[PDB]
Amino acid sequence: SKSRKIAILGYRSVGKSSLTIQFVEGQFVDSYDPTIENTFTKLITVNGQEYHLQLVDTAGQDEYSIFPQTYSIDINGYILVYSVTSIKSFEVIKVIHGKLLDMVGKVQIPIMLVGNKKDLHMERVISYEEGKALAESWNAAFLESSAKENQTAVDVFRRIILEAEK
Amino acid sequence: XXXXXXXXXXXXXXXXXXXXXXXXXXXXXXXXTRFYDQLNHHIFELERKGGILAIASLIGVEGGNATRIGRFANYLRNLLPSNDPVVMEMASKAIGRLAMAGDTFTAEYVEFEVKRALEWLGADRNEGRRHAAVLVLRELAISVPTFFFQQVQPFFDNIFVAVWDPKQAIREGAVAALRACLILTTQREPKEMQKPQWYRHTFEEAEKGFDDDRIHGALLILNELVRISSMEGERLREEMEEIXXXXXXXXXXXXXXXXXXXXXXXXXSLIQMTILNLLPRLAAFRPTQYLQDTMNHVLSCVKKEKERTAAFQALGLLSVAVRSEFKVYLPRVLDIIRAALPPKVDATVFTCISMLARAMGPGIQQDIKELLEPMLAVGLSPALTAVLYDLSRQIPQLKKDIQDGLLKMLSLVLMXXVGSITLALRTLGSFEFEGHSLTQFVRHCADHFLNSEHKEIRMEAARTCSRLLTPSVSQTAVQVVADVLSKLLVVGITDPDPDIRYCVLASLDERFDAHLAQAENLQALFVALNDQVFEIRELAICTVGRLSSMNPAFVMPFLRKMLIQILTELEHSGIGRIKEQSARMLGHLVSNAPRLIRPYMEPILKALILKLKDPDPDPNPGVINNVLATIGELAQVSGLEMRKWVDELFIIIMDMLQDSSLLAKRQVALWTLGQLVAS
Amino acid sequence: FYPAVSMVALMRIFRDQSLSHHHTMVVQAITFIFKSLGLKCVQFLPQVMPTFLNVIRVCDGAIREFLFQQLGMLVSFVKSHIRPYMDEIVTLMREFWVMNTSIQSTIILLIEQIVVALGGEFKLYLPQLIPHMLRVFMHDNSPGRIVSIKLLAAIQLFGANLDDYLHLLLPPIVKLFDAPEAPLPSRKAALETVDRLTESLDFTDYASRIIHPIVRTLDQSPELRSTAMDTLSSLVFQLGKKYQIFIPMVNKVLVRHRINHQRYDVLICRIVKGYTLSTINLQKAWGAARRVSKDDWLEWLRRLSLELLKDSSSPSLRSCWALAQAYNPMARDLFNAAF
Amino acid sequence: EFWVMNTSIQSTIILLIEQIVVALGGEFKLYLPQLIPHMLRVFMHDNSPGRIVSIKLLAAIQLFGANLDDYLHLLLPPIVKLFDAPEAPLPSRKAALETVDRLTESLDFTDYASRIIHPIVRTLDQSPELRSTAMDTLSSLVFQLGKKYQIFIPMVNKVLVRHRINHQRYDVLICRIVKGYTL
Numbered sequence A: 001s002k003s004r005k006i007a008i009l010g011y012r013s014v015g016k017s018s019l020t021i022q023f024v025e026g027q028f029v030d031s032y033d034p035t036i037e038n039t040f041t042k043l044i045t046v047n048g049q050e051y052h053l054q055l056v057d058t059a060g061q062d063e064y065s066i067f068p069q070t071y072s073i074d075i076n077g078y079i080l081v082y083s084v085t086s087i088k089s090f091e092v093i094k095v096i097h098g099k100l101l102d103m104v105g106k107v108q109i110p111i112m113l114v115g116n117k118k119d120l121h122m123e124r125v126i127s128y129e130e131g132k133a134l135a136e137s138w139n140a141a142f143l144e145s146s147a148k149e150n151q152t153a154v155d156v157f158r159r160i161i162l163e164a165e166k
Numbered sequence B: 001x002x003x004x005x006x007x008x009x010x011x012x013x014x015x016x017x018x019x020x021x022x023x024x025x026x027x028x029x030x031x032x033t034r035f036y037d038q039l040n041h042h043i044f045e046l047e048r049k050g051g052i053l054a055i056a057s058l059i060g061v062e063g064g065n066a067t068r069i070g071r072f073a074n075y076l077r078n079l080l081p082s083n084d085p086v087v088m089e090m091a092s093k094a095i096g097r098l099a100m101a102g103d104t105f106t107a108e109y110v111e112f113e114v115k116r117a118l119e120w121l122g123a124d125r126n127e128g129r130r131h132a133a134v135l136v137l138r139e140l141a142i143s144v145p146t147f148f149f150q151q152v153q154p155f156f157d158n159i160f161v162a163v164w165d166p167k168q169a170i171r172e173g174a175v176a177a178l179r180a181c182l183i184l185t186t187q188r189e190p191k192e193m194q195k196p197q198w199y200r201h202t203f204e205e206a207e208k209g210f211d212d213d214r215i216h217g218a219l220l221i222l223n224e225l226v227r228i229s230s231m232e233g234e235r236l237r238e239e240m241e242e243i244x245x246x247x248x249x250x251x252x253x254x255x256x257x258x259x260x261x262x263x264x265x266x267x268x269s270l271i272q273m274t275i276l277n278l279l280p281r282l283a284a285f286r287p288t289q290y291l292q293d294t295m296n297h298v299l300s301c302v303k304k305e306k307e308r309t310a311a312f313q314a315l316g317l318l319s320v321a322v323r324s325e326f327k328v329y330l331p332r333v334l335d336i337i338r339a340a341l342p343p344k345v346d347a348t349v350f351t352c353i354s355m356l357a358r359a360m361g362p363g364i365q366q367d368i369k370e371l372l373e374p375m376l377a378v379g380l381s382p383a384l385t386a387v388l389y390d391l392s393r394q395i396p397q398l399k400k401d402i403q404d405g406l407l408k409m410l411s412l413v414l415m416x417x418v419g420s421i422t423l424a425l426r427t428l429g430s431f432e433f434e435g436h437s438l439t440q441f442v443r444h445c446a447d448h449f450l451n452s453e454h455k456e457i458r459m460e461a462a463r464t465c466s467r468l469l470t471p472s473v474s475q476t477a478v479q480v481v482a483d484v485l486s487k488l489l490v491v492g493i494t495d496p497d498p499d500i501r502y503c504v505l506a507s508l509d510e511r512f513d514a515h516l517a518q519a520e521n522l523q524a525l526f527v528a529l530n531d532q533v534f535e536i537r538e539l540a541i542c543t544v545g546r547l548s549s550m551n552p553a554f555v556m557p558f559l560r561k562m563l564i565q566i567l568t569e570l571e572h573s574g575i576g577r578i579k580e581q582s583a584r585m586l587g588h589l590v591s592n593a594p595r596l597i598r599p600y601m602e603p604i605l606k607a608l609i610l611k612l613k614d615p616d617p618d619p620n621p622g623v624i625n626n627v628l629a630t631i632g633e634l635a636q637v638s639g640l641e642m643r644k645w646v647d648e649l650f651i652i653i654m655d656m657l658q659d660s661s662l663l664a665k666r667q668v669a670l671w672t673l674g675q676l677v678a679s
Numbered sequence C: 001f002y003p004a005v006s007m008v009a010l011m012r013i014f015r016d017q018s019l020s021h022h023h024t025m026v027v028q029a030i031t032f033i034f035k036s037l038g039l040k041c042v043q044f045l046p047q048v049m050p051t052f053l054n055v056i057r058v059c060d061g062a063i064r065e066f067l068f069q070q071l072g073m074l075v076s077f078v079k080s081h082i083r084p085y086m087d088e089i090v091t092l093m094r095e096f097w098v099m100n101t102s103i104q105s106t107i108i109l110l111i112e113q114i115v116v117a118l119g120g121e122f123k124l125y126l127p128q129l130i131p132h133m134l135r136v137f138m139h140d141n142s143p144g145r146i147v148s149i150k151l152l153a154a155i156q157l158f159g160a161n162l163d164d165y166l167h168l169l170l171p172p173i174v175k176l177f178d179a180p181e182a183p184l185p186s187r188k189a190a191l192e193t194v195d196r197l198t199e200s201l202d203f204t205d206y207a208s209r210i211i212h213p214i215v216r217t218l219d220q221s222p223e224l225r226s227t228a229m230d231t232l233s234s235l236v237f238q239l240g241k242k243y244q245i246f247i248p249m250v251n252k253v254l255v256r257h258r259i260n261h262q263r264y265d266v267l268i269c270r271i272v273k274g275y276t277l278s279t280i281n282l283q284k285a286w287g288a289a290r291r292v293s294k295d296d297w298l299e300w301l302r303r304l305s306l307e308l309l310k311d312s313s314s315p316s317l318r319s320c321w322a323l324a325q326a327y328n329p330m331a332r333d334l335f336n337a338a339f
Numbered sequence D: 001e002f003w004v005m006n007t008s009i010q011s012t013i014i015l016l017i018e019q020i021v022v023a024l025g026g027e028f029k030l031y032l033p034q035l036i037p038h039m040l041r042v043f044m045h046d047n048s049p050g051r052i053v054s055i056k057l058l059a060a061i062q063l064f065g066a067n068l069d070d071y072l073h074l075l076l077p078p079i080v081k082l083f084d085a086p087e088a089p090l091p092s093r094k095a096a097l098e099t100v101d102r103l104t105e106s107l108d109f110t111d112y113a114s115r116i117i118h119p120i121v122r123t124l125d126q127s128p129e130l131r132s133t134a135m136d137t138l139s140s141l142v143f144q145l146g147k148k149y150q151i152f153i154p155m156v157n158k159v160l161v162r163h164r165i166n167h168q169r170y171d172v173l174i175c176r177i178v179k180g181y182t183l
């Protein structure tokens, strides 16, 4: 009966809480309130193995924010997030990974990268290709995602558990 | 700087490792971050042993802040899981030193290490996973007892998946984790509502598996439940190594242990070993028929080679555990020990002699006189001379009989190659002889001292000849003592290696100082007073300081000029290190030679106060500390003489106590404040 | 109640010695508190603000770029109510402006939020800042002159404030959109800036200052011909028949390179003719009372207090949890309130 | 005011000190302690090509004579730290040995027998290049100490036999001490 802790980091107003609450509960409308440590829990199975996820939905880190010490001591996963509707999110997410690697040393830590708000075609400015190449350059996985589809976010949290499996 | 300690670090990857680690601790104290992090990281990946030595050297020496505890944890999680041993042990030991960092992620950390460790004991993976997890659980239980005890319910429901798995190295480990947690249980259950569910669970699991691969594991668990359930007999075991809910079932485990012993004696030599640790332990729990089968099993195993060096310990611990019934087998057992000792492992023979003598009492004596001339024929072991100390002390009629031969042994070593001399000299000082003949030994120790290109004969000959001269009235002892001290003290000033120069001078006690008071000896000590090494100077100022009563005409002038040189160093050297060392030495000079200072109270005290008033001695904390420490001692000596200055100091000190920007260890400031007010 | 308690605990840290590590944490909380309160935040101002500004002067530059980001955040929620402390703020900004991309970015974003806060009131504090602004355009080592772009984007927002100081500030703007060397993006921003300023100032004095360089830009660089026309068009709109002098002179470049804007052509023709228009995590720390020594019970307490802070429905306590772990007396003191 | 850690000025200022000392003579002793903080800062760390700044300052210190009396305990340690340390470029190291030789002719060294002798002994072992130089320092130091040297004779002898070293000056004086009749 395995138990895994997962940290969703990123820039703010991207959709960390939007995804996290979609996976855990399954509702289109979500808390439009800036969160400080919104923890969650969920029961799911991945290839027969029982996994209790404990999801740390963190407060969104800006360009300068000194990186927390709760996350360098506990966690078997990081879902680093950007939103496809700004370049802002993408420059920020590069530096989060910067500081995160400065925080833990450089060990083979289970990461992925996530592009939220794919449903927004008409406000999109980042492409599938850039983030795929950035993910590939870190030795990390990629997905695009949508808080509007519980189906997609399910596939995300499955991916990170499979990365930490390795 | 960084590349220098990097060359040292990559050198520690290839005794040299631990030496370079001690240097790393000294360099971190002298203080940069990321260069040494990158250095550790790149020694980590390939070599791994050095990574652990460095990680362990920096935990606590820095004042390890949270950025260290974030990294070090994540390094040590990718040493253990998939490994090959030795590295494994030192990784979990380093988790031991780390999980008692002090930072408030200790609950978070230890919750994580333990939950992960118990997940490796929930599916038979790589038996290195088991090896790892269990070594982690053991070391966290010892180092961090609170947070480990917090996770006890899954723990006792997950080691009995994992003593039983088919392995030899796991068994010792998985019972060591159980040993640590059951030592936590001993200190808790007096206060909890009712008695626990645990001891029953332990005994019942051991019994389920007991009823080849499963015997050894069951017997190790019994070794534990017997350890906890009678805290008396283990003391006995530990004592020889230096040189109540089981009460319900104690016949079940007895019948179980002896039956399985004789009926797996010609199978394995593992299971035999754990039986030779139960029988002495269960004998001390409840003292006829069992004892004959016991001693027949044990004494048959002493002729056979594998178990012999354990069989002696069992034979010894049984001679305490049941004294009276053992007195039948002394004619049998002394033949065994006799046959063990005609000269050429043998240590345990000597421990059995100590217990055999200790336990039953002084009614062997003449038989042990027949044992003594054998024991001495072995030569000089560390074990032997330790036993002969124990034996002389406990059986007092053999006080003279021991030392008769033991000297004309030692004499035969030091009339008539190298590493033996060290232990011979250590013996010569370290237990009490009743011969005047020692006067020849001390004068022959002039040979060992002067020569010996080997460092260790010198450093030990020193530590001997100080100890032997304690008869320091009549005119033969006096000339000898004085003749030695000259040669002895010469080495203390002159010898090239600092360590001998320290040792010699430190050993020149208050016992001698009426010989140190002579002009010539004193001229030499003053040379020490301005040595190359700082620690030696600190020592010599104390020494000369003691003598300033004894022969004041020589001393007091020298000490005055020393005082002037000291105050000059304080005012006029711009270097911090020099001022720090200066004030520190002034501390000693004040406390030690009070008669000298009490006239020069005002000057000293002004010069000291004026350090505290300056704005730019903040780049070194130790100037301000050692200045305050001195004011403490200066206060002690003065007394009312230093009344008018107290208000000035009091403002200064209380201003330091609040707002620690002038960050003295408040320990020192509070101490001084206390001292002023006291004096 | 809740915001008031948190504010007092936070500010008790917010005084040198403990902040050596935990500045950032405190300020992140505060900013979240005010964000959450609305305009009822205003009551805490005189507690926070004097300490806050003194922190900036005292602290190390490791932090300092962050504090200004968050100061500008306080400014935005509070809006005009910050006016009493504005002197000190401007003194701080004036002290910590240097010719380095590092700080300048953030300080300029601060100005952006001050202007919108004070509105008409900013006009007073403007001249303390003009010496620095003119020093930015005059010389700047920024990659692609982006510092000066952001400052242009700030100047866009000054509106009627800029009235009394346009004669200072308009020349160096013009010197961007005329000079050949200047990288195209900066140059564009300067043209678009003059377009914004036209909607809320008068340009009748500076017809000759602006028009001749636009005319020059139309010739030299073909890339900005659309952009510059959209500046000029609006400038014409604002001038009205005062433009009648320039029509022919400008026309002689408009025919040269065959340039067509609806907006321009319309207005010229129009001038000449004359007619313009929550509990599952808590439950672990409640009855975990299987405890026996001092350390065992204290650690029950610690974990309980923090477990409370995470839950607590009030945002102004939630905020602190982050800090409450890293500094434990924050949890200690909020314990009762948290509970 | 105008002392800095730069070869540029230091050279000249040190030449100034050289001319002041000879000017004032006995009087310089008063003004010395205002300058010691700078002098110790020169030896402690110096970026000079081949440490020549510190050579010139050694060559200055050679001239202080009896002035240096009250401050030898300050100034003798960093001098010693040159002639012991492995890294130091040979010319500087030589000057420091020759400096202690000069100072012996116009100060007392009885306090600092142990400070000086042990490093000389060390230098005799490690580097063979300065064996003549260091012997000529030691010889003079022995001359100045007199029978106070009697302690050290054997200890030093054990390196003097090891590398087979012969100085008239040294051998003469040791034999002269043991028998007891100095000129």
Ligand SMILES: Nc1nc2c(ncn2[C@@H]2O[C@H](COP(=O)(O)OP(=O)(O)OP(=O)(O)O)[C@@H](O)[C@H]2O)c(=O)[nH]1
Pocket (backbone or CB within 6 Å): A011, A012, A013, A014, A015, A016, A017, A018, A019, A031, A032, A033, A034, A035, A036, A058, A059, A060, A061, A116, A117, A118, A119, A120, A146, A147, A148
């Ligand atoms: N329309 C639409 N909106 C989305 C989608 N994904 C996320 N969002 C919106 O993103 C907005 C901001 O995200 P939040 O979840 O509030 O903020 P956050 O990412 O948790 O970051 P913090 O504020 O730092 O906690 C929300 O108002 C969501 O409605 C999507 O697929 N479609």
Ligand SMILES: [Mg+2]
Pocket (backbone or CB within 6 Å): A016, A017, A018, A033, A034, A035
């Ligand atoms: Mg959120």
